[PDB]
Write a protein that binds this DNA or RNA. Structure first.
Ligand SMILES: [Zn+2]
Ligand SMILES: [Zn+2]
Ligand SMILES: [Zn+2]
Ligand SMILES: [Zn+2]
Lengths: 48, 67, 1114, 166, 45
RNA sequence: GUUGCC
């Protein structure tokens, strides 16, 4: 429907994508080494 | 490990009767039931304390750190 | 000493276990690996070659593990107990000899190191093989250790005896809604795992395969195998005068549909629709690729020219697919024991040795030609100096292959995980029960309770009273006491031998009478087509009884079909039985008297012809006999001993033939968690968490099982006085009351031992780790945290610790990741502290502290903690027949009953168990229990027999006690008699695990997780409980609407959110940050798990727009 | 780090009551409760190849691995000083590893590196001198010959009384 | 004092700090701390 | 994160 700014049907495919705040993807340190083993979700957003 | 110092059930001492019970076996070859009756374990609950006691200490001491 | 064969057959059962022990399957496979099986592998990957510079060749002449060929000393080796506390691998190096072209000429070189194999204890390549407790006393290892387990880099492990469905044979399958198939999985020993299937779509027989692009019907693939006359097709599969002609004749006209009619045209119908794996040469002939497509299929048989023996092997496979469509009674199950193949340790690590060894000599080949691609570097170069760089790939492959139980194979591309486990040193028999167990395959039949159930073809093969419950209730099984696993022998001599016994060849007989006659199946293939088998099969046994052929052969001969079977494949289960020829056995007690004199062991009995092994198939033809007083003149194979159906970990149950059948399985899960003793060297070892017990007792009523494995010589549990009665209400169901006095005299004082370890690490910039300590204050070094540091930093041995009070002081540098500046400027004070604190709810001691060095030189610190405790209430006592109990209350000594002589009963059970649980064995344990120590002799309560009851009552009544054990008592509370009598005496009670002080837990306001801010799971993670989803369903039926909100927002996960009104999505401290006005802000509170949904759901392109009303003015 | 009323600087983590809080000894105001525990491409390629080469020769020489990673730091900064270009890759790692052998003061003498590559000793020591001048190693321990005795005796197949002979 | 003892040599050696980890009078590489002389208190129950 | 057990 109309009467909202986002109601046009072109927004249902990607043109801009948001990046989630980093509390959702915490940089966990496994404490076996002084390098941080980063979770799965950053490197998916990094490679794109 | 070594023989317990008292009976579990009644409460008398069995610490002088362990090596004496062995001494009734190498010499004076005898039935083990009638041996302790000569030694004087009259009650029932004292008989089980020395019949079933595995003497584990005569195998631990051969593993000594002082050769 | 007048002996007979009536009851003294038992005295040969220990002769079977003396020379052939309890770890039979684990050691005798690894001993077959190291001696014979390694030469058969270098002979299959020899002569690595380089195409550049073609006159260079490295070939392997032999391979040895252990001793050299120069010095010819026994071995130079670290002892295993010296190895198991330094986190190293007990290994001996592998030596080969090689010859090659150095240059001007070829030279041979001896004793090259390539790797370091681990050796399991009590295998003959270790030091501990054939020791007489004098060398073993120097090596401080227990004589009673079972052996058969790796100790790879510290913690000790063992691989399990895994099994799968029988490869290289056939089954049948029956399905209602899908049509019926029959599987035939086969495995050539190189790079192939191929399985074939025969499907009946809508009334027509078909054939598919995982290398053909689509389905190819059945009349083609038999005309391609030579049988073309199209009357012989019906003549093989159907026979004559039956209904099989009416079902099968539909298939014959599809030959007329495709117009083939001959053996030439039959092949290229396949290769027209074969799926082409590209060999990158691909000179495909359109006649040659079909002959190989009729060669890489059903890899039991391969052919030279004639195709003929492969042809009717398909015809016998398609006979059973029309026998099943006639009636569904002909179906077989895929969990029958005859369709199971146990396969053991050393012939299973041999597969992993392939994929490493071929990975050795190809990267080593890739290092050769990288050097030989030089013009000047061609004349005097030697290749042996770059073998040490590729050497340890075998070692580091093998060590993680035992550590992490997952095997990355390549020639099968298969990923079996969970192949090893860490062995339980909690009890003695727990270290032996896990040595004999079987892990299944889990092919995702979780709905089918077929293999969850237990089949009757199991009597004496493997144990029936032992199986865990819960996560696996029928998929973990255990070997029986008398049990041997077969092994392959050979197959071409017996095929030559059966021809001699009067059988013909398949290439002479027409199929007009093979259905009239019988047929021998050697590993499932028809080779002889014999008639009159009962003359034939009895002449075959009589050669085996004299021992011309190997004894692991079975002559299963069924009659539902017209066939007989031969098996020689090895890896199947069997037990031995004594031969009974006629109405008299071949026992011959004059032989049995000569055994107790000692000159002939068990091995001589199978040489003369008095005993032979029987597998699960040969049980079906035989008519085995229980006892010698039940011989029929048509009756063979007397039972060697009837109580051999229970494994070595269920055998400690006394009189298991009286109690109920489920109340033996509930003890097999808990006998393996019994506190007791471990080994003779148990105060020496430094392992993770051991429970030790102060004053053990051997049990009162023994079994013939437990004197085979020396359970009495280091037992678990005491035998206290039990007077079964209700008392004081604290024993309602299976609780139990024991005095304050007898535990004070030393009844069941357990002892807990714990390891902790650190490693002093050397960093990049050459900075160590230091053990400095003992800071001072106000004339005194010892602070409240420093009463047990010692002068060396290692906390000194002998005194107690509490919460706080560190005991290994550890300091690490701060520049752990900086670049090394090549100078000496500022390294004087850089150590930040990081000690190790002792937590815990109870003060403990430290038992002994050692330090040593690891494989590569780093200092080790290993201190062992120690604490003991008195058995207060809450702890879990047991009864060895499956009657658990929490200690209800501890009362003083004067309150219990007391007999005429003054005996106070130790532990009181209420009588509310024996009717429901039907545990009559405990009631028979006590009658034999009271009589033994009064007579002064231990008594034998075995399985399927033992000390009888009627002669056991007489010795009780000769002393003055009751004839049924039921003595009278007085009351300790009030002084007079009891209106009823009390069943009375000693019962063997072992203490169990799961004591209460390491399960008491409480968390007020503790840690929160980093992602969702809830409390954190795990006791060592400082806990916090999960209020689940049906517990959310449990509250809602009460109609409660306030404590449900506080326990899901306020007490757990409260969070403060300021949110906007218009265009309603969240904002931070004082904004909206999408309409940057910061005016319409309304404060609320929501759970953190509701905020975090409202952000990651906004990360994809859907928006939770919030809308807000006020509460008031409804 | 600084309290809110008395401005103390020392905070003591009490761990007896499963709270693991933060509080000073002076007044007793908590700081924070509810703790939050956490449960060029060719430039990268040319050292990844150089990693395996240091991984290679450390295996054959029985080097304990805490020298290999330390020796990687020497090669990494000597990469920046334009020393590796032109010279042999199989040579320059041998001189690089040998420096970290003598900072650690091990038994490994230089010619054992020269043996398996089958080259002259004096070639490997030539680039060792031409390196050690360029990146200015000043401090460096002396090759004490006392190290070499107690390593020789193990391979010298002598009697059981191997401690009195050293 | 009465410092570290060997595993089977049972020879009292006091290692000076950051020097060695082995023992003398034997080629063995495991050292155990000898038990302290300070008075320790116990109950009798 | 993955397994073992009650
Ligand atoms: Zn007594
Ligand atoms: Zn807004
Ligand atoms: Zn303050
Ligand atoms: Zn020593």
């Amino acid at each position: 429907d109309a009467t909202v700014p986002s109601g046009r049907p072109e927004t249902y495919i990607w043109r801009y994508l948001p990046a989630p705040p980093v509390c959702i993807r915490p940089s966990v340190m496994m404490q076996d080494s002084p390098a941080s083993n980063e979770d799965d979700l950053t490197v998916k957003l990094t490679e794109i | 490990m070594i023989v317990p110092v008292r009976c579990f059930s009644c409460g008398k001492v069995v610490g002088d009767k362990w090596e004496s019970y062995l001494n009734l076996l190498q010499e004076d070859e005898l039935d083990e039931g009638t041996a302790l009756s000569r030694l004087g374990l009259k009650r029932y609950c004292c008989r089980r304390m020395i019949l079933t006691h595995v003497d584990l200490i005569e195998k631990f001491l051969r593993y000594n750190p002082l050769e | 000493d007048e002996i007979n064969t009536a009851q003294d057959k038992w005295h040969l059962l220990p002769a079977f276990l003396k020379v052939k022990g309890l770890v039979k399957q684990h050691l005798d496979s690894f001993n077959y690996f190291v001696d014979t099986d390694l030469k058969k592998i270098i002979k299959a990957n020899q002569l690595i070659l380089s195409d550049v510079d073609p006159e260079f060749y490295l070939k392997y002449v032999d391979i040895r593990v252990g001793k050299k060929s120069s010095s010819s000393t026994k071995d130079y080796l670290t002892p295993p107990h010296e190895c198991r506390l330094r986190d190293m691998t007990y290994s001996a190096p592998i030596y080969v000899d090689i010859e090659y072209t150095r240059g001007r000429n070829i030279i041979m070189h001896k004793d090259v190191e390539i790797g370091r194999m681990p050796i399991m204890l009590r295998s003959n390549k270790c030091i501990l093989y054939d020791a007489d407790e004098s060398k073993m006393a120097k090596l401080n290892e227990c004589p009673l250790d079972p052996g058969g387990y790796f100790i790879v880099n510290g913690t000790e492990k063992v691989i399990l005896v895994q099994e799968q469905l029988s490869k290289n044979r056939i089954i049948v399958e029956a399905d209602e809604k899908k049509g019926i198939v029959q599987a035939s999985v086969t495995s050539s020993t190189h790079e192939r795992k191929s399985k074939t299937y025969v499907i009946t779509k809508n009334g027509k027989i078909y054939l598919k395969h995982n290398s053909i692009a689509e389905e190819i019907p059945i009349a083609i693939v038999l005309k391609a195998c030579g049988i073309l006359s199209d009357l012989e097709i019906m003549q093989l599969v159907c026979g004559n005068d039956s209904s099989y002609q009416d079902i099968f004749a539909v298939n014959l006209e599809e030959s007329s549909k495709l117009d083939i009619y001959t053996q030439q045209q039959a092949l290229e119908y396949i290769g027209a629709k074969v799926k082409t794996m590209r060999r990158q040469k691909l000179t495909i002939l359109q006649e040659g690729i079909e002959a190989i497509a009729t060669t890489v299929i059903a890899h039991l048989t391969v052919e030279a020219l004639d195709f003929r023996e492969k042809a009717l092997y398909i015809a016998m496979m398609t006979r059973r697919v029309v026998m099943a469509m006639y009636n569904p009674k002909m179906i077989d199950d895929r969990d029958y024991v005859g369709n199971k193949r146990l396969e053991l340790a050393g012939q299973l690590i041999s597969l992993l040795f392939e994929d490493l060894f071929k990975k050795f000599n190809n990267d080593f080949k890739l290092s050769i030609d990288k050097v030989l691609k030089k013009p000047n570097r061609a004349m005097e170069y030697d290749a042996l100096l770059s073998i040490n760089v590729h050497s340890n790939n075998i070692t580091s492959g093998l060590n993680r292959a035992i550590s992490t139980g997952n095997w990355s194979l390549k020639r099968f591309k298969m990923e079996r995980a969970g192949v090893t486990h860490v062995l339980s040193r909690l009890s003695y028999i727990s270290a032996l029960g896990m040595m004999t167990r079987i892990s299944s395959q889990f092919e995702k039949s979780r709905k089918v309770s077929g293999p969850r159930a237990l089949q009757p073809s199991q009597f004496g093969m493997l144990c029936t009273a032992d199986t865990p419950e819960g996560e696996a209730c029928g998929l973990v099984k255990n070997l029986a006491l008398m049990t041997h696993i077969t092994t392959d022998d050979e197959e071409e001599p017996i095929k030559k031998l059966c021809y001699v016994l009067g059988v013909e060849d398949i290439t002479l007989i027409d199929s007009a009478s093979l259905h009239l006659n019988y047929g021998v199946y050697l590993n499932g293939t028809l080779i002889g087509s014999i008639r009159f088998p009962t003359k034939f099969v009895t002449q075959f046994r009589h050669l085996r009884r004299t021992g011309k052929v190997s004894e692991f052969i079975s002559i299963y001969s069924n009659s539902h079909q017209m066939a007989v079977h031969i098996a020689t494949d090895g890896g199947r289960i069997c037990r031995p039985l004594i031969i009974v020829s006629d109405g008299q056995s071949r026992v011959k007690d004059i032989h049995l008297r000569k055994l107790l004199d000692g000159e002939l062991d068990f091995d001589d009995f199978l040489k003369l012809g008095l005993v032979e092994y029987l597998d699960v198939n040969e049980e079906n033809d035989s008519y085995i006999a229980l006892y010698e007083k039940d011989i029929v003149p048509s009756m063979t194979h007397l039972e060697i001993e009837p109580f051999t159906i229970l494994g070595a970990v269920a055998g400690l149950i006394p009189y298991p033939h009286h109690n109920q059948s489920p109340r033996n399985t509930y003890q097999c899960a808990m006998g393996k968690q019994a506190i007791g003793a471990i080994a003779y060297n148990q105060f020496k070892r430094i392992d993770t968490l051991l429970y030790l017990m102060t004053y053990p007792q051997q049990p009162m009523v023994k079994t013939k099982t437990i004197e085979l494995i020396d359970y009495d010589k280091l037992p678990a549990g005491q035998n206290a006085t039990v007077a079964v009665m209700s008392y004081s209400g604290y024993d309602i169901e299976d609780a139990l009351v024991l005095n304050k006095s007898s535990i004070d005299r030393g009844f069941g004082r357990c002892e807990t031992r714990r390891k902790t370890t650190t490693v002093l690490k050397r960093y990049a910039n050459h900075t160590q780790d230091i053990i400095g300590g003992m800071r001072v204050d106000e004339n005194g070094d010892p602070i409240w945290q420093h009463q047990s540091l010692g002068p060396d930093g290692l906390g000194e041995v002998g005194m107690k610790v509490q919460s706080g009070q560190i005991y290994i002081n550890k300091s690490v540098p701060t520049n752990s990741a900086d670049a090394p500046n090549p100078n000496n400027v500022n390294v004087q004070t850089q150590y930040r502290e990081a000690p190790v604190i002792y937590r815990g709810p109870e003060p403990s001691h430290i038992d002994q502290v050692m330090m040593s060095v690891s494989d590569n030189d780093q200092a080790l610190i290993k201190v062992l903690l120690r604490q003991n405790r008195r058995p207060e209430l809450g702890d879990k006592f047991s009864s060895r027949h499956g009657q658990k109990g929490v200690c209800g209350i501890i009362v003083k000594q004067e309150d219990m009953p007391f007999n005429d002589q003054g005996i106070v009963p130790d532990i009181i059970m209420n009588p509310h168990g024996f009717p429901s649980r039907m545990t009559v064995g405990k009631m028979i344990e006590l009658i034999s229990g009271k009589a033994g120590v009064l007579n002064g002799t231990l008594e034998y309560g075995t399985c399927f027999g033992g000390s009888k009851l009627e002669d056991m009552s007489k010795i009780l009544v000769d002393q003055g006690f009751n004839y049924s054990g039921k003595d009278m008592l007085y009351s300790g509370i009030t002084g007079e008699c009891l209106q009823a009598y009390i069943f009375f005496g000693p019962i063997y009670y072992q203490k169990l695990k799961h004591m209460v002080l390491d399960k008491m837990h409480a968390r007020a306001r503790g840690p929160r997780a980093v992602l969702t801010r809830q409390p954190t799971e795990g006791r060592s993670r400082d806990g916090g409980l999960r209020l689940g989803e049906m517990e959310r369903d449990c509250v809602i039926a009460y109609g409660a609407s306030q404590l449900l909100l506080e326990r899901l927002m306020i007490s757990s996960d409260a969070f403060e959110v300021d949110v906007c009104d218009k265009c309603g999505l969240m904002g931070y401290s004082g904004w909206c940050t999408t309409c940057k006005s910061a005016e319409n802000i309304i404060k609320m509170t929501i759970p953190y798990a509701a905020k975090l949904l409202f952000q990651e759901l906004l990360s994809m392109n859907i928006a939770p727009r919030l809308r807000l009303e006020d509460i008031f003015q409804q | 780090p600084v309290c809110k009323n008395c401005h103390g600087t020392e905070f003591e983590r009490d761990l007896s009551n499963a709270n693991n809080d933060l509080v000073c000894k002076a007044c007793g105001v908590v700081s924070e409760d509810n703790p939050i525990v956490s449960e060029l491409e060719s430039r990268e390629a040319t050292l990844n190849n150089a990693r395996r080469k240091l991984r290679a020769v450390s295996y054959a020489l029985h080097i304990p691995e805490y020298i290999t990673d330390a020796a990687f730091q020497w090669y990494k900064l000597a990469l920046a000083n334009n020393f590796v270009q032109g010279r042999r890759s199989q040579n320059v790692i041998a001189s690089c590893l040998y420096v970290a052998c003598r900072k650690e003061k091990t038994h490994h003498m230089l010619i054992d590196f020269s043996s398996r590559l089958q080259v002259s000793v004096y070639s490997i020591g030539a680039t060792f001198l031409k390196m050690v001048k360029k990146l200015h190693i000043t401090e460096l321990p002396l090759a004490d010959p006392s190290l070499f005795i107690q390593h020789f005796a193990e391979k010298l197949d002598l009697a059981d009384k191997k401690i009195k002979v050293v | 004092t009465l410092k570290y003892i060997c595993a089977e040599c049972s020879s009292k050696l006091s290692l000076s700090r950051t020097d060695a980890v082995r023992c003398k009078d034997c080629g063995h590489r495991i050292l155990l701390k000898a038990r302290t002389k300070r008075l320790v208190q116990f109950e009798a129950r």
